[PDB]
Symmetry: C2
Subunit: 174 residues, 2 copies
Amino acid sequence: LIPSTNEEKEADAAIKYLEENILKNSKFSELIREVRVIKDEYALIKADLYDVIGKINNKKTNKLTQLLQNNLKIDSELEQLINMIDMAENEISSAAFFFDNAQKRLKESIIKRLESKNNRSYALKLSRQALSDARSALSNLESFASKRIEPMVRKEEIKELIKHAKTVLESLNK
Amino acid sequence: ENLIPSTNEEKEADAAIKYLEENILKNSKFSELIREVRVIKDEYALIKADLYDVIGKINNKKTSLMENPKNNRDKINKLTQLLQNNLKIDSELEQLINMIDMAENEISSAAFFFDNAQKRLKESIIKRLESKNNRSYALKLSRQALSDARSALSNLESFASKRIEPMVRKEEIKELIKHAKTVLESL
């Protein structure tokens, strides 16, 4: 079940490259929750933010109006970061997928290769029984052909001996 | 589409099979060969019949004539010798009948093996192409695997890079909120 084809090796290496350097003993699970945590951390910020303009939008009824727009520029900047954060999650989904699919594909290749070696064994065994059968077939013909003549020859002689036998029998009745 | 034999062993069998086909089974056919026997089989049957018939007529003359055994001695001796003779013949007739049965069996097995032969070959060439295809697939798989491994790396980097600014401005904006919070408590 171990990579031999250079093609199987090169794949193996690529998967290990991720296992060894990038993931480094950290399941996709671990990384997903890492993103989830921070999307929450950010969820609660925008909450705080809108809640705390819920507090200025009443107490300005100026002195400050620029805060509304200073910290709405934010509300924008924040929206960007929240979508960066969600976009990130999408990627690590794609990652997870292509990763599993890499590993599966590599098991599959190896199996498929071993399968193809057997299929060849069976083919060969079959291509030899094919001869054997054609040699059996011949052995019978050869036999059959060496039984043809004995009868044809003998068969008249017998017919006569019997011709004669019924002669003798009819002769007594005299 | 490809169905032609390649492997040395395929040609060896194809050759063997084609050889019986061309210069023998055109030379003499398997239906012809059977009827040829199933005639003489049927001729030896009539002769067995003819013999068994005479023997009866013998046995019977002899049976009847033994109710005058002293008066019919020579007669009965002729008849016994005759009857003993026909068993000897019958016995030889029997082997010839058997010989001919085998002959019939053989030629029928000739066919059997020959048919199988043809099927057996076909069935190998299939398994070859099958294993050919599979090995082909194995490769394709070995390469999708790698292409998967790369698409995975590419995603992980997009993922890695995308989460930075988010990570880096987090507490920056926390303090920027809560600075603005106290500036609301006191005015």
